[PDB]
Amino acid sequence: RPRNSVRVGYRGTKFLFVDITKHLLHDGEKEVYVSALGGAINEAVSVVEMLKDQQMVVVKKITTSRQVPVDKIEIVVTKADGFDAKYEEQQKAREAKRLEKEKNEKEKAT
Amino acid sequence: PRNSVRVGYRGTKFLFVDITKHLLHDGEKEVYVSALGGAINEAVSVVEMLKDQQMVVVKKITTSRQVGPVDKIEIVVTKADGFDAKYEEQQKAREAKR
């Protein structure tokens, strides 16, 4: 299973696969292959629609297939315009809240 | 079990595969197979069944989202080569059995 292939399934959440896809595009991957089998095909669409709602990715290709019956979808997404700028502002905002929670937790303990 | 009703999608995929075949046979150059939310899976399997029967080829697949959000898939299928010959053979076998 390649690094740029995210398998959407029940051993995870839609929020986790969105985060993994964002991290893979930010961490060198030019394109991410978002795939799912059978009843999870809709959930793979929800993962990509969330990335599109956040204006982070653009869909490059969608294919359906049947593998060894089990049906399969595969959506290939690449970085959208302003991905780096919108990912780093979200990282800055997530660290600001992670430190403020730590600082107030330490202060509450003292 | 006579008193057990199993609710499922098997009779739904066969109906929509049949509907799609009839529209292609009745003049339509392309059929837009779409579904919302949890029905996206059945729409994909409906197209895979049509591809398995060598009836259609996928020309385009798009996804969209409307306002819980509602996700939508849209698969555009066209006639494959030898559709008429396989549609007439499927009709002959269904009329023979009826």
Added chain:
Amino acid sequence: RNSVRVGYRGTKFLFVDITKHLLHDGEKEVYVSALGGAINEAVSVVEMLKDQQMVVVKKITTSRQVGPVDKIEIVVTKADGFDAKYEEQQKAREAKRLEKEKNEKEKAT
């Protein structure tokens, strides 16, 4: 015209009709069950039967089989006045089948 929208409306009606026929055809209780993503439609099938005042829910259980597959099982029995309401639907379904048959022959023009 060239757009096929795949959905569950009609499939819920088939199982609503099947459940009604099985209760009318001797069965005291019908077990309405479904797996995974069809659990929602199985619940809607029973809610449709409840609005028609045809069944009453006797028991609902959930279970898990080997990803894992979840299962619901709703046991419905006849409601009071089911026979009186089923006979009015059968009579009305026959009035329409004779009308469609007579219309088919009258369309010989």
Added chain:
Amino acid sequence: DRPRNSVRVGYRGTKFLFVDITKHLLHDGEKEVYVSALGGAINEAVSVVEMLKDQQMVVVKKITTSRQVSGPVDKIEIVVTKADGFDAKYEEQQKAREAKRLEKEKNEKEKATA
């Protein structure tokens, strides 16, 4: 708009989060938790309860279905209570979550001072 002991399973959260919320609410005094969902999320509410049943944490006290307006919207509601040995199995899960939190904090401060 809902009571404290009512968990609404939906798209604003994961099944893992609703399982944890239900466990936390039962451990923090609540005698019963109402696990409910609407329409296409009804199956996901069933998976949340089945996960709690696999962990032998809850027992199902009641399941009801109903219909409300938005077309009509169908709803499931599962009432769960503590199973026997819930406290002993929840305390082992709490103990296991602190062990991993202290192992990560101790290791990440060790790595920062190498």
